[PDB]
């Protein structure tokens, strides 16, 4: 992906994190586990929701064909009518299919971005109090108990304290 | 002691297309195209259609003897006519501005 996180330096996703799209896995002396970053997650849900509704709604006004019939000596206008109706269908078929392709690409990249930013958010807190392992993980120099871990997820990790 | 960042995966086999890549497996997707129908002509919002069966609009309106079924039809939602109804003008001829009248019927 464009942002290098998903299926990049973070090799794979987690079956074990059920509760959100992005989050944290911690590991210390007390144990280990997954925790979803809800805010980053809810941001993503709001964006994708708005997108789908924007797509659906933009295609709201669109060509509706009507039945018109013509006799044996009105072939020209019958042909005109047919070419006209087919023409609009092809145009709207193109618009729909292309919008879906373009916005699918942007949706996948958007998730990649949200992961990258979450990783950097944590990196920028920890700074040189941890080893950046290069796989999505940070190994602490000090012991980091569950309250310490929570402060990382918080945005509250007190750097001068360690 | 460590903290790791990661993302969701699941057992999904749903696929989507993009400009640069086709058949990308994603964790979730939303189909937006209806592909199925019931194969029947139905009441529209409870209001039954006028099904002319073997009669045409001309046979109906002029009162072709074979089209007595439609001697006094109730309110309809839409009208259904075959491609080549057999009971059209029993006595051969023309119907002047037939198409302009059929258009009038759609209102």
């Amino acid at each position, epitope marked *: 992906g464009l942002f290098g996180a998903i299926a990049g330096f973070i090799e794979g996703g987690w*079956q*074990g994190m*059920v*509760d*959100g*799209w992005y989050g944290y896995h911690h590991s210390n002396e007390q144990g280990s*586990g997954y925790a979803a970053d*809800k*805010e980053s*997650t*809810q941001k993503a*849900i*709001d964006g*994708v929701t708005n997108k789908v509704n924007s797509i659906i709604d933009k295609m709201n006004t669109q060509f509706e064909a009507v039945g018109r019939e013509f006799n044996n000596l009105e072939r020209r206008i019958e042909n005109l009518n047919k070419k006209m109706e087919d023409g609009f269908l092809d145009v709207w078929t193109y618009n729909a299919e292309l919008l879906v392709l373009m916005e699918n690409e942007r949706t996948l990249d958007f998730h990649d971005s949200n992961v990258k930013n979450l990783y950097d958010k944590v990196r920028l807190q920890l700074r040189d109090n941890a080893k950046e392992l290069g796989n999505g993980c940070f190994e602490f120099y000090h012991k980091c108990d569950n309250e310490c871990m929570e402060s990382v997820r918080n945005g509250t990790y007190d750097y001068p304290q360690y | 002691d460590q903290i790791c960042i990661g993302y*969701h995966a*699941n*057992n*999904s086999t749903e696929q989507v297309d993009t400009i640069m890549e086709k058949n990308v497996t994603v*964790t*979730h997707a939303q189909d937006i195209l209806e592909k199925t129908h019931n194969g029947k002509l139905c009441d529209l919002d409870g209001v039954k259609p006028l099904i002319l069966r073997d009669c045409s609009v001309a046979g109906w309106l002029l009162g072709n003897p074979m089209c007595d079924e439609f001697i006094n039809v109730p309110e309809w939602s839409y009208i259904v006519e075959k491609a080549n109804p057999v009971n059209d003008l029993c006595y051969p001829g023309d119907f002047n501005d037939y198409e302009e009248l059929k258009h009038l019927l759609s209102r």
Partner: antibody
Amino acid sequence: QVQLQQSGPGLVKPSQTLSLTCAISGDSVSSYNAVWNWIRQSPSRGLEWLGRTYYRSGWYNDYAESVKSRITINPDTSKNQFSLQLNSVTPEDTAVYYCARSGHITVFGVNVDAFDMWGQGTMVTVSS
Amino acid sequence: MTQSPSSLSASVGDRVTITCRTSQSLSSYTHWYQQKPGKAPKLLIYAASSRGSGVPSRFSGSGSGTDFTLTISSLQPEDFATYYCQQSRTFGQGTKVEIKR
């Protein structure tokens, strides 16, 4: 429709173990579109989520911080049920215990912890 | 999760609005339950504004930032209950709705 049928004794002596079971019908304990939870309610504490188990290419459990050291929630894939075990009970564990399914309803495939089905409840009294 | 008011009385047919103020604003993770005496809670609203299975149209939900609202457009006698909001694993304290007659 899914039904959840609870059982287990409603009387536990102080310091001993509370043991409840939720038997599922209409769904699988190991379903990828289910999470199996225990929640309790008391007039004092209100509604409190205790823990859960779920299967996603392997079994997972999460437990509430308040009970983590005392609690176990195990699936039984022979009988399609899941249990609650709560050790070293005190009077503060007196409550109505409910099992409930979550993650059946999801926003874009993400479990939101919305609990769509609940069992009938077991009233548990801690007393000698 | 803080609900307001802790209880209310209203007449049959009244419009009733209950509020839940949340520590963190997530529209998708907030739900409303209705609990009648002696019964388990039943899911009423999910993801701020979707009606739960079997829930009548007089019940609706809205969300703005950290403020969430449950509205009963026309109160019925059978809507006597305690209503709880929920984000993640946290429940509000509940609002008791009593009928006024």
